[PDB]
DNA sequence: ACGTACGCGCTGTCCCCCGCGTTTTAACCGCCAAGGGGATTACTCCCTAGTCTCCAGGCACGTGTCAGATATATACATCCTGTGCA
């Protein structure tokens, strides 16, 4: 989430958006939280509730 | 008025840094998070000098005196002139 990129490609004007990845870690869910920000910005940054 | 010789114009030389293509490295980012010490703000004593004060004294000023420069007697000192001679 704090890298510079993050903010970099979110601007963009687009109407959809497709991650292709192989596969994302089971633990730490800062980044699958991550990933489901990245994918539509409408998630709250609880992810310890 | 003279003069002469160096600034200037011209010509030949050669060489050195610019233009461009190819090689190599400095820095920003991702990871992966942590602390750290130094100016800042606030507070709290504490004691050195402003201010007032009076007592003393010392360097600018006036005068004494020698150092150095100056103008003038002076004892010889070199031409000139009578002057006597062989």
């Known amino acids: 989430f ?3 990129r993050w903010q ?3 601007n ?3 109407q959809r958006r497709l ?3 192989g ?4 633990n730490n869910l800062a ?3 991550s ?3 990245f994918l539509m910005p409408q998630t709250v940054i609880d992810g310890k509730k």
């Open 31 to 33: 980044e699958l939280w």
């Open 23 to 26: 596969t994302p870690l089971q």
């Open 2 to 4: 704090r890298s510079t």
């Open 35 to 37: 990933l489901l920000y």
């Open 8 to 10: 970099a490609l979110l």
């Open 12 to 14: 963009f004007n687009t």
């Open 19 to 21: 991650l292709l990845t």
